[PDB]
Every structure is written in C-alpha cells, then in structure tokens.
Design a protein around this nucleic acid. Sequence first.
DNA 1: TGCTTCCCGCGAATAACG
DNA 2: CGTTATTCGCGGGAAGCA
Length: 121
Amino acid sequence: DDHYELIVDGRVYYICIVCKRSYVCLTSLRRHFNIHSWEKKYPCRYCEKVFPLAEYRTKHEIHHTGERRYQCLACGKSFINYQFMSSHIKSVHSQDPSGDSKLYRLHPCRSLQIRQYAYLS
DNA sequence: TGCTTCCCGCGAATAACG
DNA sequence: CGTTATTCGCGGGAAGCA
Ligand SMILES: [Cl-]
Ligand SMILES: [Zn+2]
Ligand SMILES: [Zn+2]
Ligand SMILES: [Zn+2]
C-alpha cells in the first residue's frame, strides 16, 4: 500500500510509508502521497510548470491572471492571496483577520474556472 | 526578515456508482 | 437519477528562500 496506521489513545494516525509524515485523515495522506509517486500530474495551463497537488496549481494559475480576490474591508485595497491581505491588515490596520474577523471579503474566482463555494456569493 | 510557497484538517461541490 | 465516494478550495500557521 502507501501507508501504515498508528494508534495512540484510541486515536488513529495514517503514516506515509515513504517520509513517515502523520495524517489524521486518510484523504490527506493520499493527497500528500502524490508528491512521492507523481501518479497524477497538475500542469499549469499558462506555462510549463507542473504541480503534485491540484490546489498548488490553482494558486499558481491565479498569479497568471492577476486576479485580486482578497479585499480589505477597512480601506478597500485588494490582494492576490490571504497572506498579503493578512499582512496588510495587521500592519496598516493593527487588527487580526483570524477567527471570524469580518475584516476581509474573499470574492469568488472569476478569472479562472474553479469550483465555486456558494458561501462566497 | 519580508516576501513566497507549502501544508493539512475540514467539509462543500461534484464525479462515480448502482 | 439518489447515494456514496472522491476531489480540492479554504484558513492561517509553518517552512523555505534570498
Ligand atoms: Cl480583480
Ligand atoms: Zn510522504
Ligand atoms: Zn504557470
Ligand atoms: Zn486596508
């Protein structure tokens, strides 16, 4: 297979047979394991690059379109990802967007065709 | 040390299946 | 199709890099 199981305190962990990383969720081990096997490939559809996780490709492709989905609700400035948004809000507004802050809005993705969560509309 | 990308629990969206 | 099985978007802390 691709893993073995470890059980401490009645709680189950799934361990990657290759690098021994531990996962609470089997789906996470599977997602991770592609890094080792390259069974599935996620090539960028704008350049040569190829990724081992679907989400790594998606975040990369947003860099190509230049879409700015993260918007600061205190001043209206928008950002390409959470990290730049969070960094802005902490440094400029001295506030933490963690928890449920209501300090930012994540717009739906319109520059790419990805799965759309209803809660963003 | 400030960008930049990675990581993984969680669960909504959707593909697979019967 | 209903139903369950799979995918992968998301937060936000960690790790990587120059
Ligand atoms: Cl935009
Ligand atoms: Zn591994
Ligand atoms: Zn690319
Ligand atoms: Zn702002």
